[PDB]
Amino acid sequence: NQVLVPNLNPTPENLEVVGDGFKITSSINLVGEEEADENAVNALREFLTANNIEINSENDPNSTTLIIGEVDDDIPELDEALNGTTAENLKEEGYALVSNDGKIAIEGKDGDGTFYGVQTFKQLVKESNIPEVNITDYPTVSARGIVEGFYGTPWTHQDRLDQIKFYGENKLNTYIYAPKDDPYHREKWREPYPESEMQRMQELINASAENKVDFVFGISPGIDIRFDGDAGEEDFNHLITKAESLYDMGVRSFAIYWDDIQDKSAAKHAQVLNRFNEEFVKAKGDVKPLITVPTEYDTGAMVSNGQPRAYTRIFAETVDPSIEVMWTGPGVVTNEIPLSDAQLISGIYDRNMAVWWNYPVTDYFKGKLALGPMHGLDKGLNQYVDFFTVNPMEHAELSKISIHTAADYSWNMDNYDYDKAWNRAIDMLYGDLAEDMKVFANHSTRMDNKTWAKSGREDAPELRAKMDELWNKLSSKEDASALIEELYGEFARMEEACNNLKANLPEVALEECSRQLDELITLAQGDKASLDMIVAQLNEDTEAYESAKEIAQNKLNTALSSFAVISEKVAQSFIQEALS
Numbered sequence: 001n002q003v004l005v006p007n008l009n010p011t012p013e014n015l016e017v018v019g020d021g022f023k024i025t026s027s028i029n030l031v032g033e034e035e036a037d038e039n040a041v042n043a044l045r046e047f048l049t050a051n052n053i054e055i056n057s058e059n060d061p062n063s064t065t066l067i068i069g070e071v072d073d074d075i076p077e078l079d080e081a082l083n084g085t086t087a088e089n090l091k092e093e094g095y096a097l098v099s100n101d102g103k104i105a106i107e108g109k110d111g112d113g114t115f116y117g118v119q120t121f122k123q124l125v126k127e128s129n130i131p132e133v134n135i136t137d138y139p140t141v142s143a144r145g146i147v148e149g150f151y152g153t154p155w156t157h158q159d160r161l162d163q164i165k166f167y168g169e170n171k172l173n174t175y176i177y178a179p180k181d182d183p184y185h186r187e188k189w190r191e192p193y194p195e196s197e198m199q200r201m202q203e204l205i206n207a208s209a210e211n212k213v214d215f216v217f218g219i220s221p222g223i224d225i226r227f228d229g230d231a232g233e234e235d236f237n238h239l240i241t242k243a244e245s246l247y248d249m250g251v252r253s254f255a256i257y258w259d260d261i262q263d264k265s266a267a268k269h270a271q272v273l274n275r276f277n278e279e280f281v282k283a284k285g286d287v288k289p290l291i292t293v294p295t296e297y298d299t300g301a302m303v304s305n306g307q308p309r310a311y312t313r314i315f316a317e318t319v320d321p322s323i324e325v326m327w328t329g330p331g332v333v334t335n336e337i338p339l340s341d342a343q344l345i346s347g348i349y350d351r352n353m354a355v356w357w358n359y360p361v362t363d364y365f366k367g368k369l370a371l372g373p374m375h376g377l378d379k380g381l382n383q384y385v386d387f388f389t390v391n392p393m394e395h396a397e398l399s400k401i402s403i404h405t406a407a408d409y410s411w412n413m414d415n416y417d418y419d420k421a422w423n424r425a426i427d428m429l430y431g432d433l434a435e436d437m438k439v440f441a442n443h444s445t446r447m448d449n450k451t452w453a454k455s456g457r458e459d460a461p462e463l464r465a466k467m468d469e470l471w472n473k474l475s476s477k478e479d480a481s482a483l484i485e486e487l488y489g490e491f492a493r494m495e496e497a498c499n500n501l502k503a504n505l506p507e508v509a510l511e512e513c514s515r516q517l518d519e520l521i522t523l524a525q526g527d528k529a530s531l532d533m534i535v536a537q538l539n540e541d542t543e544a545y546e547s548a549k550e551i552a553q554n555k556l557n558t559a560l561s562s563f564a565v566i567s568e569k570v571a572q573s574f575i576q577e578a579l580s
């Protein structure tokens with residue numbers, strides 16, 4: 001029978017189904033391996049090994065045939081199997097994939113593209129079966145990735161190697177390495193890596209390249225940099241020396257941060273940029289565009305009554321237009337970047353901008369996990385933005401859910417559906433546990449420290465609606481009891497799911513969310529007690545009510561003084577509501 005197209009992330013620009021599917025044989029003829037991108041071919045080899053698919057050395061016409069290469073390779077049998085499809089006319093990083101009557105063909109516009117075709121290929125195949133499809137695919141935004149920019153417990157080395165492979169698998173191509181643990185990033189910002197630190201950095205650098213990730217080395221000399229006279233000169237050379245020493249280990253992307261600094265003059269920040277850009281970036285000729293974050297980096301701090309402040313205005317004139325400029329949106333952590341905000345800032349800097357989006361980062365509100373999708377990001381932003389990065393959580397495993405959606409948003413922006421993306425993330429990442437994780441993660445999408453920092457999808461919004469509806473039914477004495485029954489079932493479901501997650505989540509996830517699992521179980525029991533209160537009072541029964549009321553205060557006080565935080569406006573607020 002038919003072979004269905006599995007979930008893919010990101011969603012490819014164009015995918016047509018052309019056959020029923022077929023089973024890839026025990027082993028295959030691989031064609032083009034000698035001409036095609038070395039990293040694409042190694043990804044392919046690893047996948048084939050991990051799935052017990054051998055490679056014939058002698059062509060066997062009984063065996064499935066896999067042909068891989070770039071446009072700029074001369075592989076006639078690739079064009080033959082593509083049978084009309086082509087990557088020739090796509091942007092950079094695009095590719096074409098055709099799977100049909102026993103052949104798979106992958107043609108990248110460039111090697112990045114080819115590597116990305118392999119990542120699609122990997123997603124399409126299940127228990128050796130592939131659908132017969134026809135894909136041409138390319139990204140909306142051209143830098144797409146992560147900045148390691150949060151505070152708190154930095155990621156381990158093993159976390160980073162895991163993330164980088166993950167970024168490659170979801171077609172993210174940028175990783176800004178600016179950890180606050182690392183002295184060689186800020187304090188000690190002059191000063192090459194020791195010797196004891198070189199083997200670690202080298203592994204980060206090489207893993208990145210192997211997965212088509214731009215390892216951007218982030219530097220932050222605001223701590224103590226001198227701009228004037230001999231000191232200015234000496235420090236500029238320390239900057240150059242430092243970048244040379246990283247150039248020498250393989251680094252070909254650099255970012256310079258001015259976000260925390262004493263001497264706060266735009267003209268001086270932009271001169272150090274412009275000179276580095278000339279004397280280093282351009283001189284080397286294989287270094288990617290320099291990146292910077294300026295001292296004013298949110299619309300709040302950058303603009304006043306539609307007019308740039310002094311800093312921004314000066315920085316914006318002075319700074320070379322080849323330089324990439326990061327800004328976080330309307331504020332540092334904000335609901336939205338609407339098109340008008342992008343336009344405004346893009347206009348001022350007179351260029352396509354770079355986004356530093358502070359979600360899912362939780363460093364400002366550590367008890368809550370941010371497990372929701374990219375949200376409030378206007379689906380036309382690519383008109384003014386061609387570099388998009390997320391600042392994730394200290395919790396690397398669970399950051400994968402938001403990051404997975406950032407991958408769809410930034411690759412295929414027209415078609416981005418936050419809720420569809422959110423479900424696909426959980427489905428793809430959590431397997432046999434996805435339905436349970438969805439129940440739980442549903443209550444942990446929304447960030448709000450109640451001062452300055454608010455972003456993300458509202459928690460569990462269907463359930464909020466049923467809770468509001470229950471209060472209307474009660475307070476205009478209409479019948480409520482179908483709903484009450486329905487809500488007993490929801491709260492039971494919450495508890496069931498979180499218990500199943502505690503029992504079955506692998507440690508790598510469990511250990512980042514177990515406090516919250518417990519917290520949501522508690523609030524769920526208090527929610528259950530809160531309906532017990534409502535039933536008791538509608539049956540005028542003080543015994544059952546004062547008993548239930550005690551149980552509900554009990555769960556609320558546990559949650560209120562636990563470190564963990566979750567479902568503040570839904571599962572937690574329901575209990576507060578019932579007790580008033």
Ligand SMILES: FC(F)(F)C1=NCCNC=C1
Nearest residue numbers: 150151152362363364365
């Ligand atoms: F002020 C600090 F930089 F230390 C800080 N700011 C944002 C909130 N998260 C943790 C620390």
